[PDB]
Amino acid sequence: LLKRDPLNSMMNIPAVLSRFAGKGLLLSENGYLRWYVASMSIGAVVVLALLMVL
Amino acid sequence: MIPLQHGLILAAILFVLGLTGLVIRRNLLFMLIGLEIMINASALAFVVAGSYWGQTDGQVMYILAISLAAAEASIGLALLLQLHRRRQNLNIDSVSEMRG
Amino acid sequence: MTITPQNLIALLPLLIVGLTVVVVMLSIAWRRNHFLNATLSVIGLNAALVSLWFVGQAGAMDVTPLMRVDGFAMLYTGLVLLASLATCTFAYPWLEGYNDNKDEFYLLVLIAALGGILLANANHLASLFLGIELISLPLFGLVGYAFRQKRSLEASIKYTILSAAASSFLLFGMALVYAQSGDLSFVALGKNLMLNEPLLLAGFGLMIVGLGFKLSLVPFHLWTPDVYQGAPAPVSTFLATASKIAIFGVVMRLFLYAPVGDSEAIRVVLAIIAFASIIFGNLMALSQTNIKRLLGYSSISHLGYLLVALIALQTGEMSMEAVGVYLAGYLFSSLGAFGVVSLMSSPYRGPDADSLFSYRGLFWHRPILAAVMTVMMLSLAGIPMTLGFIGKFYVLAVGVQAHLWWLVGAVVVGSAIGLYYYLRVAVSLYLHAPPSNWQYSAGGIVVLISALLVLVLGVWPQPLISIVRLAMPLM
């Protein structure tokens, strides 16, 4: 049962989550300028709403 | 007896209209036009704020704003010329080969 | 108020850089001479760098409502002048292979350096706006200097459009702040307030949108790998060092002087931006096979660490010297890394050497450049015996002192992710792969001096601590 070292795999879980999150975040860098402008507008909306609610 | 909020709201409306034009237009010339609308709306907001306080600083900031607008339009037109010369089209989605 | 002769003495690097802009441009008009115009530009930048001594002998005082010269302005002027001098040194062997005119490069570098000095001395919303554009527009030219290539033209168009959008955002935010406050001076942004006025907060939010674009802070960060990869490698050196350093310095000055820096909502928004910036920039660089894009995501993460140091500015008293030490270390490490990239891309031959397969096995033909690049990868990772660790240690101490535990944990996690990709680059340098001019040797000497400074000030950081603690502004 233990010859695979299950605790080592359990501690390798955060590395796998890091790869997954990085590959997901790299999808936002599609190279399109209009999407970059749209993301700046989205961030402006988020920042302004967060400042208004606090 | 014009309220300051009315002038600021008018400037905000023009700003978000220019930003929408910048986002929804694939032609680089219309994107430059939307950028001009954006900077002119911000300069109008500065003029409104300067007129509310009775200060020349609003029009001074307006002057600096349109100086930036002129130089930015100059550079944008040079880049649009290069895009047209090297692509024969002004589609901004075509210049997207850097990604990842 | 007017300009005193003492004020003119405090204006010395600005005056010298403007005068050498005019002189270099008139020399270009007389005759295109790449060697002479590069020499005149570096002579002017060195003259400003040594006129910093007279500026220090003058003292700390106000030059118009727009500018304030203190030791902080001295430190950031020196940082941007060193970055510009290194950029010119890297630019000459690159421009030696450029078939079109090469002399305009140094003109644009000098005007961008002038914008950096103005941002170092900026005490006004007008000064901050003008310094931002005086940095940005010559970089529109410099990023697209090799406009005959796909990537440089793409990066120029992206940077120009997005920086115009950010300037519009910043100007509208400045106008809202002015409508609330009635003064554009930094100290009066919140004097008439109860500090959470909605229009003041919205204005500072739109300014945060523009400034976070300029600092590659999440979510205004998506341009950074594209423009870093597309731009010429000395332009990438300048864009990574001088622009980030000058804009973060004026952001530090604005948040130190304005009474709305102590507002809780702005601090929470900046904490969210710093957390997301550190984590996202480290995560996105994990799987990068291009050294320029990897360094762009790296710059996002390092500006997140600096933002963590800025969040604790009102709470503690170590934040500003932490930012100074961090920015010195980051300047030297980025100079070394981007300079090795530039020297491997010199002379210009079209597409630069930015793939990691090009740097794989670099030690077997360029051992000194490989040693410099691995020292820089260790420094950007925040590994002890490097100056980058001293900066990371300052950031962690500042975060612990202010009880910013989410940011401290973010720094730890991002440091581990950074360890992965930086060590990947540094060990790929030593695997097995399948010039001859004094200006190229000067660039090699610059990256070697940066590597030695990073190592020595990582082992013995106290002179840098004393220098940064001496560079104190007016409270």
Next chain:
Amino acid sequence: MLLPWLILIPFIGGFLCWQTERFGVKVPRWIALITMGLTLALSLQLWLQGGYSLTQSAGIPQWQSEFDMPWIPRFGISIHLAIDGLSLLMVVLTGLLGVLAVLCSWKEIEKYQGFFHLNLMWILGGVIGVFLAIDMFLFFFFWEMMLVPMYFLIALWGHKASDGKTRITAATKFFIYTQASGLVMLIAILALVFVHYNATGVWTFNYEELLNTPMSSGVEYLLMLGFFIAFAVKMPVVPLHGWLPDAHSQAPTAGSVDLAGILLKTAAYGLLRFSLPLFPNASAEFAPIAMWLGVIGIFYGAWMAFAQTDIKRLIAYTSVSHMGFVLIAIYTGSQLAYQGAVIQMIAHGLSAAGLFILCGQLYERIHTRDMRMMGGLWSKMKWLPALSLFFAVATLGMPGTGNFVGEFMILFGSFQVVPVITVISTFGLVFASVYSLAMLHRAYFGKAKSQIASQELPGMSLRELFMILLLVVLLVLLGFYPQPILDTSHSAIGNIQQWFVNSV
């Protein structure tokens, strides 16, 4: 006054190993041997002149030697070295293992041997600095400094049989584990420094000043947890152990990187020197969790060692089990168990050094580390299976070897404090005998399971035989006469134990 030279002679020697490489390719090994012998001789002279046998426990701090020099005065950071009995034993062990590591890679005539020797000496100097530093920043600095040459040795000079990517992955995993845990420890150090600065008003990273730090219950627990996370990664304590078998399997095949990098137990020393005196109450409440982590480490490491088909991986998991025993000893507050922990640290270093050197020589002989391919090697080799039998006999806790002295004194003290954990750990000693016999029977007894093991293999050289027999003699003398070692560390252990039980 000799402690700066105890750290500096390895660094200057590594620099001279790099520099004298151009004089000849057989020169850097001689330079590394001379400076490692000089470090060992200086530590032995400090042992002779220290008078540790006649030293009584006067309370923490109590240093036989001390050096101070200002380093970063803005934060109150100094190069502050101090040696006492426990640190002296660890430093002498480091010097002996460094000499063994130089002799172990003696037949490396590669084109870049000077860089290998520089990395080795830099690792050894960093380990000695860890054992000597009492400034907290300096301790952390040495702690994270010794990992860069470790990373480069594993990544570039490592196991030739594996491909490049596996060695890079093992080195990266080791570096990420150790440096992230170190950064958590740095957070704990900084928060302790700031708590002291708020209490008093001065900056200090000194161990002696930071001892008298009034903290609330809960803050002290968190600082203790950060320190323990760093030490648990480097001990190794389960589940923060996974880096170790891959770091051993991808280490350079001679074994010198196992001796220099891993087999020196800086984490147990750090738990005794820092975690117990700086946070005695938090360590007292953490004692059950740490004890059960040690029990799980003993049994998990034994089961992992039995299940390995690689002999080097087997020895790495034996190290995990033995450090589970030491971790049980540390958190018990007993003088007898602490002295057993010191003996067990030294004996585990010696026995694991012997096992790793013998495994490297065996891999040189048969070109494979898989035990499914080697069998009946007693009839094929002149010296190696008998010495491997001796060292596997030592690693199961055989009386006559120091491993028994350490393990049983630990168990005696632990039973005086915690009996249930002790009885479960002695059944762990049965598990240790199981994995040692399994390794011995799979490697050297039986019939040949392949063609390489079916032929006669070359005998061990005089240098390899000399170093293995020196390790054998030292382990036997530690088993039969452990009193000089117990008298050397008696005062330091007494100070740590009295501080731990007088503040709870």
